């Protein structure tokens, strides 16, 4: 019959609410809902839309009482205008967790089904570019059935079927031979009910000094490949398990029980090797990172509104925003995607990019000790960034103007789960958009906005944040942060004063006593489909230099520029001097001037962190000769569709590279084609005290600029006189 | 009794009045208070607190009244705590418009002083370091007279005198000997004066296609020195003019007459030659950057508020926030200088810099043709980019939950100038400033605030931004933006498919028909005198490496670090490497882990147009050779007073290096010493037609990071 306590109602909702006891009352946001209302009032007001109450909010003993069709009549009113509903369908829409659940339901009634097969990825295997182009420019329909790309693990094997969702079929059904699979969740409880049930595990740890070896928490690493130096058979089906000490202070990672490796069979479920090293004491103190020691400091509060709604529509999985149209999609591997971008240029949509992602990316260490010498996190293709997205903490993570997205991939099981506040879009004021203030004249000033989409992963210890930045003049920006918990190394020394402490610190900061930051490196690598005003583009270098001047008076240099063409893959893969300008043309599209229409890559634009130059290894390191996208920065390949992991489809203890070695071995012509740029960029991690026990966000900066794309300054406006 | 208009008043004295229908209620925001009320009532709420009102606010026809006694009562009642009254004057306080005048007066007295000296700087005259820390971290009071240097131009002689404010009294009168005086503002219209009543000139403009010769824009440039290859006199103070055709698009810089500059003689106020190359046709057609000929698309709004007030206290120029401490002041020349800067460490304030400002900039160009060869902006230096500095407008330029602070200087006649909205003081969202997401656990994530200093400089065509950017974790930013209106070449070719095409575009871009964007490069210096956690302080290297294992097992190599000091200023003045680590260490002062406390110094954190890797010139080059500067990112120097400027005091046709060349010269020991890090960065600007006919703003960045300064995050607060 009843009414619920608006406060108790709101809150579950996720709605912030503020009450102004002088203007008696109410503002509650809620994505892109900004809704006023009065105790009493029989409208309410919804992004500056009045809507009419059946019942009004009612105040009591200082309780606001609320329909309990609330929420519906006002949050699901209409009057907000944020996302629509599409009328056709976008052909990369993710699979809905209706055609998650077929696929595994075709997969399984396959007669080589067997029970106990886990799913390591279930995706949408999508049309051909030249449908899914045809149908975002002129809205011609795919005629292709919806396919799922279904990757499974049957033990230490991987299997690969392809299914037809619309004709409910299996197209196909591979062994892949070689290949080990990427580590699953399930395999943290595994590892860590091994080591819990092991004999042989406590007596080592009781000699280090734990007593009570059920405080013992374990972390599952990958192997990688050493050529059988690490005395590992290359068949098996292994993971290697570093461990910390539970103290009770919410930090484990704080805890290391240094060099102390259990190497597991996941497939026989126990202990292969245990590796021991010199017993390290445990650095006992408690270090919270979580705040349970500390008192907060008040901070006055700071809102950013959007009174009237948002300058962006979301219909479907599509984003409109001013003058781009993109597509935004979800994979449990490389997590975000941004499809079928364009660019309105005075009612003209002009291809910018066919589809953008996180590539792969690695986090390799510099220590040579029996627990660091073989860690390497290749966090996307060995972990499943997607997978582990982290929920955006509203107001903290994001500002208090974004709209959060939920997102559905599918589980290791098969089964749909749905990730809340997945992803965060929000716009951002970015300072002046340019301007002139000529003396003796009025002001010229425009504000700068800037659309972010927002995505953040943790693995481990470990949480990066990634940021595609949409600017309104044409410019696509890519930053990449890290936070999160620093690997530490249990040693000896407290102080730099103590006897351990120079061999101690040889491969890391002393950041606390008894406790290391190893130096390592964070690598990103991007996978850009960039399809500049059409797809058949060029690469061209223009190197700014010095010359004699030729031309007489004072001056005995000049400023000019080297131009030429790279033509083929193995030319295109280099470092990036950024005092240099790289770009992807279309010889066949000029602008106004006669300049081929381009866009400027930007690999390194900049970072918190001292700078990646390349890998930090030797040329003779495994790592390094199975991971060659390390060591360029921009790499740019003919497309072929399978193309799109730079560590290759299967880095797990993979034996050559696979990835970005691979694809640029052919080298092809990048002479007006098809072409895929991938940028490589990173940080060198030398730790400081500041950095624990949590570190404060790093970020690094990439950018995509109009070159000779648009004809004068892109945000100027509509021309008020002529054709 | 009798009220004034709430909206014309408001509006007047510069606050945001925003009118809700269907709450009944006025939200007002001017700086620091966020003000709301409703009419008839008798209180009103100042950031977040109630006030009594005299007279209730009156609805008429839709119009509200307000009180005379209104703006006082509200807006100066004591509850917007944003700004606070300083009892003892910080000693670096710049110059009052009262002293401006006393310091003016004082020189003016002198039987020396000439009646038509114009005054190319008047500034204070500051107290010993030793004296100013000691105020700053421990209340002492500095008693010494406030004293100001007063820097005169007569004709084209420049004189230094020192007056003692206190005592009235003239302490020094001091010509200097061959140095040439900055650009003053008269300086401009004479040039265009000059020009216009010039029969030779216009018959030299009528050449060239231009008829009616008033039309014509002229703008001054400094010539530099060639020892004479220019074919000018180092005696003389002059000048060099370059041309535009007005056309009434409100951007005569779209119109360039190509190779035509005219040298004027200042003292003598004439042309003393006119240096002509090949007729090149004005380029005509329209280009506004105005939005004259534009309609723009619709936008919502977006509004950030504050309605409790903001967390940093101004106390006279002092700036209170979270842990910092530090002094704002204004400068002709070089515009803000921030100075004793400390972070209250737990109860402790502890050294971070003495000083920082702008040190200086320049801005060269790459074609040797005769209107571009001599070519190079020394904004601050010969312009004075304080003087110069654009008002900025709220709401587009700084965001709107900013404070606008007003700053006095002289100007070129010796009378205080009050620039308005001088500088923007506002704190924005940065992202988190840390988070751990722990499987199956709680998240832990905080919000990162940023306090933004931003200044904005015009001079001629281009607009410059400052930001001086506070991090709660004890770093400090260094950002600057570039906009405005590109220096141009007027040039034959149409488009690239023309035969003059390749010749017309040797030396930049075809940004738009008959147009070229000359390349250029833009070069910022930074002069920042930490005293990191006192004034003792060395400078130290750490080069990540890779070394072969010698520990065993599989790897054949390891990351470690090559870590040395670097000893004196000539080994300090280095190019920077970004893979690298550079620190100024306190040798005396270590951490709990026993390391030294330092600050970690970037020049370079990044850039949206190319890198400079460092100057764009054959070191041959008489600009190469006086401006020392431009070529490497990291100088390191020992603290002398009077060491300020990167390009040297007076660089008006400098013959040598006066600047930083200079200061390291005699390579002094920089071991446990007071020292001076100065700080190279810039771009090479290579033009597109984007950024035509207006500019979006391009940012380069610079970090300076706590490095074993702190104990642990300093972020975490304080332990219960
Ligand atoms: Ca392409
Ligand atoms: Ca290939
Ligand atoms: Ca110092
Ligand atoms: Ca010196
Ligand atoms: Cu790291
Ligand atoms: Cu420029």
Do not use: C
């Amino acid at each position: 019959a009843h009414m619920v306590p608006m406060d108790k109602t709101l809150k579950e909702f996720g709605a912030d609410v503020q009450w102004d006891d002088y203007a008696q009352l109410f503002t509650l946001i809620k994505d892109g809902a900004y809704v006023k209302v009065k105790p009493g009032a029989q409208t309410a007001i919804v992004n500056g839309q009045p809507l009419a109450l059946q019942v009004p909010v009612v105040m009591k003993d200082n309780k606001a009482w609320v329909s309990d069709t609330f929420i519906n009549d006002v949050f699901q009113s209409g009057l907000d205008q944020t996302f629509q509903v599409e009328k056709r369908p976008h052909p990369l829409n993710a699979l809905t967790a209706d055609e998650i659940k077929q696929a595994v339901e075709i997969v399984k009634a396959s007669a080589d089904f067997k029970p106990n097969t886990r799913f390591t990825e279930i995706s949408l295997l999508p049309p051909d570019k030249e449908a899914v182009w045809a149908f975002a420019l002129e809205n011609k329909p795919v005629d292709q059935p919806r396919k799922a790309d279904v990757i499974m693990l049957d033990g230490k094997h991987i299997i690969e079927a392809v299914v037809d969702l619309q004709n409910n079929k299996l197209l196909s059904w591979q062994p892949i031979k070689d290949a080990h699979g990427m580590v699953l969740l399930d395999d943290f409880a595994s590892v860590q009910n091994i080591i819990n049930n092991s004999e042989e595990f406590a007596a080592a740890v009781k000699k280090r000094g734990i007593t009570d070896a059920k405080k013992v928490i374990t972390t599952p690493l990958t192997v990688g490949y050493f050529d059988g130096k690490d005395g590992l058979k290359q068949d098996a089906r292994l993971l290697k398990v570093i461990s910390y000490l539970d103290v009770g202070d919410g930090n484990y990672w704080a805890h290391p029980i240094e060099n102390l490796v259990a190497v597991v069979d996941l497939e026989q479920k126990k202990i292969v090797k245990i590796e021991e090293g010199p017993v390290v004491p445990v650095p006992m103190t408690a270090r919270p990172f979580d705040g349970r020691d500390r008192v907060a400091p008040a901070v006055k509060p700071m809102q950013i509104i959007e009174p009237e709604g948002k300058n962006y529509t979301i219909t479907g999985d599509m984003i409109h925003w001013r003058n781009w149209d993109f597509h935004l999609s979800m994979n449990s591997r490389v997590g975000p995607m941004i499809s079928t971008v364009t660019y309105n240029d005075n009612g003209t949509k002009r291809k910018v990019m066919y589809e953008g992602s996180l590539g792969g990316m690695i986090v390799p260490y510099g220590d040579p000790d029996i627990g660091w010498y073989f860690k390497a996190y290749l966090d996307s293709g060995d972990y499943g960034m997607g997978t582990l997205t982290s929920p955006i903490a509203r107001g903290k993570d994001a500002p208090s103007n974004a709209v959060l997205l939920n997102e559905t991939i599918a589980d290791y099981t098969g089964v749909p789960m749905e990730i809340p506040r997945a992803i965060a879009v929000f716009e951002r004021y970015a300072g002046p958009e340019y301007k002139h203030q000529e003396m003796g004249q009025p002001n010229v000033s425009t504000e700068r906005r800037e659309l972010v989409v927002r995505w953040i992963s943790t693995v481990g210890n470990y949480d990066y944040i990634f940021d595609w930045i949409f600017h309104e003049n044409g410019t696509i920006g890519i930053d990449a942060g890290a936070t999160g918990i620093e690997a530490v190394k249990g040693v000896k020394a407290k102080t730099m004063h103590d006897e351990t402490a120079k061999d101690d610190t040889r491969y890391g900061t002393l950041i606390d006593h008894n406790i290391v930051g190893t130096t390592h490196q964070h690598i990103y690598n991007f996978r850009l489909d960039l399809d500049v005003d059409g797809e058949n583009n060029s690469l061209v270098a223009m190197d700014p230099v010095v010359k004699p001047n030729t031309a007489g008076g004072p001056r005995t240099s000049t400023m000019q520029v080297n131009q030429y063409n790279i033509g083929n893959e193995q030319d295109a893969a280099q470092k990036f001097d950024p005092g240099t300008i790289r770009l992807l043309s279309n010889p066949n599209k000029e602008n106004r001037m006669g300049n081929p229409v381009s866009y400027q890559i930007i690999p390194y634009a900049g970072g918190t962190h001292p700078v990646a130059k390349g890998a930090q290894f030797a040329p003779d390191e495994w790592i390094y000769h199975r991971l060659s996208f390390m060591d360029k920065q921009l790499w740019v390949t003919r497309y072929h569709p399978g193309e799109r992991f730079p560590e290759g489809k299967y880095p797990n203890r993979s034996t050559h590279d696979t990835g970005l070695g691979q694809y640029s071995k052919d080298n092809e012509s990048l002479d007006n084609t098809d072409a895929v740029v991938w940028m490589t960029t990173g940080t060198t991690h030398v730790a400081r005290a500041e950095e624990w026990p949590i570190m404060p966000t790093e970020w690094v900066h990439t950018l995509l600029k109009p070159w000779n794309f648009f004809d004068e300054t892109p945000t100027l406006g509509a021309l008020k006189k002529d054709k």
